Amino acid sequence: GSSGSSGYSGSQAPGGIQEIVAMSPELDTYSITKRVKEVLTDNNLGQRLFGESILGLTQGSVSDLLSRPKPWHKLSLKGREPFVRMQLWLNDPHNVEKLRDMKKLSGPSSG
Template sequence: PSSMLEVIAMTSEIDTLDLTSRVKDVLQFHNLGQKLFGEAVLGLSQGSVSELLSKPKPWHMLSIKGREPFIKMHLWLSDPQNIDRLKHYQSQIKGRCDSSQCKWCLS
């Protein structure tokens, strides 16, 4: 296996429907769009993210490559700082981070 994601893809099993439903909930709750999420977390375009979130294929129907975005989503969901990171990424894309106390900017 060439990447860490491939290792996880072969060893674990993910309920893609449950996973995507939880991701959508979190994103909507914080008003974060598919384009932002795709760029910052998955490395995919908005259209791709839309297809993954609205019609996720069951785990056993996916190739190793196809499982990678879902693994990234799973890792992102378990990251306690996921929202903070995303919002900071968002603020850097457009204007600028307005908080002088921002912990991401300090480092």
């Protein structure tokens, strides 16, 4: 048999990116930007689109992010916000699938 009582439950969270980022380990901004660029180049993707759909960033802002990332320590949680989404977007196996699907097929542009 047994007797007594033990265990518990009853907690929740608000959610949101900044709380994922809060819990995050040191996400090597450089190595992520590197791997992210290389994923864009492999798939011949355009930096902006990734920045729009994933990061909510202007192309100026995304291209600066990839070009010269600040270190994780320098970045506040709002600083780390995009790089966390990049780390997870690298791990997501249908990441590029959903990203191409934004553009899908389009009509002709230039010659």
